[PDB]
Amino acid sequence: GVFNYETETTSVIPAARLFKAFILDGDNLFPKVAPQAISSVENIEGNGGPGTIKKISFPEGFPFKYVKDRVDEVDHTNFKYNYSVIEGGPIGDTLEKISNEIKIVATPDGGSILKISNKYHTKGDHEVKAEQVKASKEMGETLLRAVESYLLAHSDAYN
């Protein structure tokens, strides 16, 4: 079955620039700006659109070794990005996939709002726990804040 979790957070970076950096260039940026959160990102197959598979490795001492993520949809107009965790980490005999949807919306102050949905698809019925959801949220926030700091400090990056 499916467990749905939604959250929202804000950024001081305009939506299109944040989407270009945080979403479209995370493979380069995450290991650079948050090496204590993501050790590397490997492109396994695909050229960035639907179906592209990446292997995200975590640093030593993290709960999980890696996950493989698959790009589902990339909407460059509406700043929507859908991707799924399809192997590694929590995926296995209790959890088949985690489907994620991010939407970045502009705010008139020149920042943005990120709307995030995480859908856990379980095999049989193995409750998803609050700590697993919390860990995902914390990781996404850490990565967001690291990218935001980089964008603030490198004005010529990503426009």
Residues in contact with Na ion by CB under 5 A are 118, 136-137, 140
For residue 9, state whether it binds ligand NAR (rule: CB under 6 A): yes
For residue 36, the 8-state DSSP code is T
122 binding partner (options Na ion, ligand NAR, none; Cβ < 5 to 8 Å by kind): none
Q: What is the total count of residues that contact ligand NAR (CB under 6 A)?
A: 15
And the tokens for 100? 């994620």
Interface with ligand NAR (CB under 6 A), residue from 13, 15, 23, 128: 23
For residue 26, state whether it binds ligand NAR (rule: CB under 6 A): yes
Considering the complex, state which of residue 1 and residue 56 has its C-beta at the smaller distance from ligand NAR: 56
Beta strands in 18-159 (DSSP E): 40-45, 53-57, 66-75, 80-88, 95-106, 112-122
Report the distance separating Cα 54 and Cα 42, nearest Å: 5
Buried b (16+ CB within 10 A) or exposed e, 117-142: ebbbbeeeeeebeeebeebbeeebeb
From 31-39, 84-92, 122-130, 140-148, span contacting ligand NAR (CB under 6 A): 140-148
**Which residues are annotated as part of the binding site for brassinolide?**
54, 81, 83, 100
